[PDB]
Paper text:
Siphophage T1 is representative of the T series of model Escherichia coli phages, which has been observed to infect not only sensitive strains of E. coli but also some strains of Shigella dysenteriae. Siphophages possess a long, flexible, and non-contractile tail that plays a crucial role in host recognition, cell envelope penetration, and DNA injection. Connected to the head through a connector complex, the tail of a siphophage consists of three main components: a tail tube, a tape measure protein (TMP), and a distal tip. Using cryo-EM, we resolved the three-dimensional (3D) structures of the icosahedral head, head–tail complex and the tail tip of a laboratory-adapted fiberless mature T1 at resolutions of 3.5 Å, 3.6 Å, and 4.3 Å, respectively.
The T1 connector complex is composed of two dodecamers (a portal and an adaptor) and two hexamers (a stopper and a tail terminator). The density maps enable us to build the atomic models for the MCP gp47 and CPs (gp48 and gp49), connector complex (portal gp52, adaptor gp45, stopper gp44, and tail terminator gp42), and TTP gp41. The comparative analysis of the structural characteristics among T1 and siphophages reveals that the majority of protein components from the head to the tail in T1 exhibit structural similarities with those of reported siphophages, which suggests that they share common evolutionary origins.
Author numbering:
A (entry chain Y), B (entry chain V), C (entry chain N), D (entry chain b), E (entry chain T), F (entry chain Q): 1 to 129
G (entry chain C), H (entry chain D), I (entry chain B), J (entry chain E), K (entry chain A), L (entry chain G): 1 to 123
Amino acid sequence: MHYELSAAARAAFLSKYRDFPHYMENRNFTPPKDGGMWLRFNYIEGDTLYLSIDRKCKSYIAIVQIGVVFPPGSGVDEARLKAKEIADFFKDGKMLNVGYIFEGAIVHQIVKHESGWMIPVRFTVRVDT
Amino acid sequence: MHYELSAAARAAFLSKYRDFPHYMENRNFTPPKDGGMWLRFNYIEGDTLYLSIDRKCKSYIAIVQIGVVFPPGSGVDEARLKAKEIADFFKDGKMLNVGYIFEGAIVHQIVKHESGWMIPVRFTVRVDT
Amino acid sequence: MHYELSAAARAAFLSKYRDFPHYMENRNFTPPKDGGMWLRFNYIEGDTLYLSIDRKCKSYIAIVQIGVVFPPGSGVDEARLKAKEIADFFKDGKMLNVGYIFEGAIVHQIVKHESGWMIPVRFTVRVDT
Amino acid sequence: MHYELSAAARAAFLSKYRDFPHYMENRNFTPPKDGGMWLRFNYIEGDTLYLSIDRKCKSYIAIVQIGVVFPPGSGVDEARLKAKEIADFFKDGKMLNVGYIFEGAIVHQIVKHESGWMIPVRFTVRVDT
Amino acid sequence: MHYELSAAARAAFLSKYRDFPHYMENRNFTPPKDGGMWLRFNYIEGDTLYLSIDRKCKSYIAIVQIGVVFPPGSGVDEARLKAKEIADFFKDGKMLNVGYIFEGAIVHQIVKHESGWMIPVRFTVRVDT
Amino acid sequence: MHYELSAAARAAFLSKYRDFPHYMENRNFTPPKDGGMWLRFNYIEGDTLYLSIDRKCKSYIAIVQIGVVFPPGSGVDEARLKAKEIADFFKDGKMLNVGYIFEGAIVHQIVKHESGWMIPVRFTVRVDT
Amino acid sequence: MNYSQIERMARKGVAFFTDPSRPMNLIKQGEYGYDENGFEIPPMEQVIPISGATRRPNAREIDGETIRASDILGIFNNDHEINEGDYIEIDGIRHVVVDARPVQASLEPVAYRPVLRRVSVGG
Amino acid sequence: MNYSQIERMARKGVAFFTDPSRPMNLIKQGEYGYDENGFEIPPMEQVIPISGATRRPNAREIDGETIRASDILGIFNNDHEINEGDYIEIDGIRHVVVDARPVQASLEPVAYRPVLRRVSVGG
Amino acid sequence: MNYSQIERMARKGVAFFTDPSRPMNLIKQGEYGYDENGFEIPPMEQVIPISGATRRPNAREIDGETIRASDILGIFNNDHEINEGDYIEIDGIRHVVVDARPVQASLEPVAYRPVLRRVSVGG
Amino acid sequence: MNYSQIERMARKGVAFFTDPSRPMNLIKQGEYGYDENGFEIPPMEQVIPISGATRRPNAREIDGETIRASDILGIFNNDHEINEGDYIEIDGIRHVVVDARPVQASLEPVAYRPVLRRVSVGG
Amino acid sequence: MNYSQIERMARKGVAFFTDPSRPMNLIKQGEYGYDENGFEIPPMEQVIPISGATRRPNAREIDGETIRASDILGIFNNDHEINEGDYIEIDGIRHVVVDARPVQASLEPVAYRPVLRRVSVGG
Amino acid sequence: MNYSQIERMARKGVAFFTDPSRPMNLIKQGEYGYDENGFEIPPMEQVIPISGATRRPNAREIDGETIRASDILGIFNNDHEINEGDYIEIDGIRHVVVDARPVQASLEPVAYRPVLRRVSVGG
């Protein structure tokens, strides 16, 4: 059921940030020419628990990672505001099209480089069948 | 008795996916010319438990890995559909020719590269003597 | 809340060491020409606990690191005096603008190189919502 | 007393496989010119336990590893039949000339390469003094 | 308080060894011309415990490492004798100028190289406030 | 007290295998010209226990490693006989000049190389003060 | 620097070293999008015949698996622009241009030296 | 050495190898600061047109992600000083000069050979 | 580029550098399949005599074990195509063609420079 | 080997390649000691004007931080000896002589080729 | 090619560069076997005097231990075949031929360039 | 091969490139032994004056510690044999010859090219 879960997550993100420059998986993307803040969307799978004896009750868990990438030299305040904006749209106990949010969005530590910096933001999902 | 277990797994996979382009162990394979979705079949052995005091009661466990390989640039939805199709044919408690399925097929995390992406799907087998 | 917490910490450092060679994050800094002791300011984020069952009581922790950099050849006593002076300004249970200090400053082990040495000093922050 | 233990293990293997191409330790071996299945004999030492307070009651444990190698391209049926042949000559509770088999031979996981594939098979030995 | 603790350690070492070629931190040293046994002095810091609920009772621990370096080719009996001499001057429960010794000197394993050998000797310090 | 203890161990070995070629630490050595079995003598220190509350009851433990090195191509029968000879001269509860043998000699696993092979032999020593 | 002269000489050289019999096509994809539910819409592709020279065949090894594939470099003229990510078929096997290094001294690419990698081959 | 002669030779060479049609701009940032409450004030930027030659196009790979970017080196004369950290736009895409190696034999830089890296690309 | 001229020159040079006395054979395998129970059927093999030159003998070391083996490179003409994975016997000892680099300027391979590796040798 | 001839030729060549306008100074430290209580006494420093040529400017990267620094190599004559650990200021910025390779064929150093590294820069 | 001419020229060159005074012997081992009770039987050895030239002396380091040993390469003619695993004594010290690269253009080895490694030295 | 001629020319060249004023000594140790109680007896040393040329000064770094040392290579004639492990003092600083590569074409070493490393320097 990872198909529909990823579909729902892609649906939500596109709904709010469709205009904002973003990267989708396995599609050829070109970073902005002037150099700016785009968003990297990644969907990481997890485990499927077997919560029964009949072997007919299982749940799926996946991790969604949204990364804010900004040019080096500008400074780090706008990236934090954007991370807060993303984190305040993916709260706990939110019912997507199919499934729900097991855990909220946690702003993590910056990953630095000489050609761009990234602030990872990730959350989880869950479906019970 | 890993011989007969691998034979049974090969029997099942080929039974349903004989036509689909696939790679079998230790045989010279050429990826599709146009570039498409082939299936990599791997059989990973495990441990042999001694569940007795007479030393005449032992069982074998093996792990079977089917990997969907697709070209970069196309996108990731068809690969997930094929993974779901694979996982819905290898359910729990399925009795093969010799041996049974201890655990079902779990769709794992994408392994990326610049010349192809792969989705690992694996399940377990067991036989009691 | 990391955005606000970061600002508060930055304010305190600036309030006392405003007139000191230092490196603010993501801004182009040039080390002193004659060769001297500057201060490196780094803000490392952490985890956000869910200390409730209503899922509406969260706390944030971040780690702030101030590093004293001094040239090789001078000797190590002035760096220790500066580290002591910094540590005696970031005591436990201190009212910042928003939040407080969970743990005080810790003078850590020197990091050596052939072009400069650094003595890391770090402390923690905490806010409750 | 690992000397006599290795001598006894060498006693047995040759008894059943003195003709099949093989490799003995520290002696110059040349793989078959045609290219086929040879056997690699390795003897790995272990622990010497002290099962007393008088310090005059000790036992020695060693691991014997025989590995069957087959050329790339042939396929895997003869390797597994040969592994069964090896495992059915190294059962539990076999009294060698000096020593006994603590644990029997189990077939391990395939180790693959581009110029040869091997199936490790190993068992254990023991003497009490 | 690492300032005064390192000061006391340097005081003791100098008191008894102000003649033997020696290396102090962050000062340009030249190994002996003829080739001989010098002493490398290093001061490694540690943690500061909070042994109270008032947050006003802390203890500081540091590790001092004295390493005897001796040329290759000579032989090792002089190095061990000098290590014993060093360890018999830094016994447990010794009151330095500020603070005391928490654990005595232990002779460690030789670190080898093709241009010199070193035998590390280390001990700990502690101060209560 | 590692100094005297090392001397005692050195004495016993020389008292028995003085004729054989051997390597002493820090002192230059040339392997046999023809090519044969030389012996590598190493002394590894350990921990220093404090078995008292008055902090004046301390004991030392060290690990001694003697290794048989033999040329590649000859075979492995002489090395094991020499290992047995070494192990039967370093039994448990043997009182040296200044100390005793805590644990006896354990013949370890062969360390292979293309220019020579080694069989490590290790035993422990102890002194109580 | 009569770049026109350099362009004409490069084109003449590439035409000198190429084999007309070898059929090579350039494939480019169109726009991609997503529906209102999150599912995708496949993009269209266009096939443009091309010609040029090749160099440096190089093979691939995958964890000891018996999978046979090869990589190859190419040289082309400035007729059809070759961006990174496109697909070029040398003789029917599809190669993805990971890097397309152009001769860089002017606005026009003058010439291309793409780096082609075999597609649908696992890591 | 008559460094002036070397300077004029280098300038004439760079003018020979450059393409006038290619538009290149140099962007430099101003002062930065922080207010009394800990927040920052954005710095101003200045755009200075420049011209020069380029060399060595090189691609970039990021963990197998399908992100396309390239890096490039350049050669410039001694008209405007080029310190490290500035931004140079080759043809619209912004490049950050990580290293700007000058011809080092005198007080004046004589010539610049900056190393340009594509900006806003993740690690 | 009269590739025919290049082909004939390459053939003449190779034939100049070979030794006729050395017996070399090319071995190719047939189709492989599986029965209705999962077991496999062996594939057939065909032996084709060949001739060529060799170069670069190189030894092999395996974890210090006393196993002796060697690898050699070869040069051949465009008489019998040499795909990767085939087996070539230099003088009785079978070598597997890990990579067979052809002279790449045309449809026909013109010449082959296979990389031969000793078979049945452990890693 | 009339080393005097080699020395004078090297001095002439170096003086040919330097720029007199560039101000460079050599800084050496004095004795250091410790008091009877364990504290230290700072050492005195002496400045000596020098002149020479430079080569190979190279940048520095530190964990992706926006810190700009550079390292340069130098060539000098045998007027003032340059031991390792001394400080040389190229144009105001202080460089530490990590290594000072002399022309090694005689007692006198003949010439120096020190390796200068930027000081007070992080690890 | 008249490989005989190449052989005689190589032999003449090796004789030119060799030193007659240096005594070198080649040692080859016989058959090895195991008795019915597992124990082994030592193999016999044969000593064959040889002569040739040497090149490239190299030292060896072992974990910083004060152990002195050296490795060296050699050149020999096609009088006695030199397979890998044999023992060659340069001047009393025994060297094991890890790799014996022959001149590979014919059935006969023409010449040998063995790689000799010092024996009884731990890795 | 009149090795005597080669030896004479090598000696003439080494004498041409050396500096007589530089004082260099060769130090060799004697026999070592142990008494009945396990303690050792120090070995005697002998000092033999030598002369030669040097090349390639190279410095050393130790974990960022401010320790200054250097390494240097040398060339010497076949007057006093130079084995590995001996000590050579260049100008008062003692260097240990880790490797002493001789010219290998004859029984006599002809010439030596020792590799000298600074002694009493920690790893």
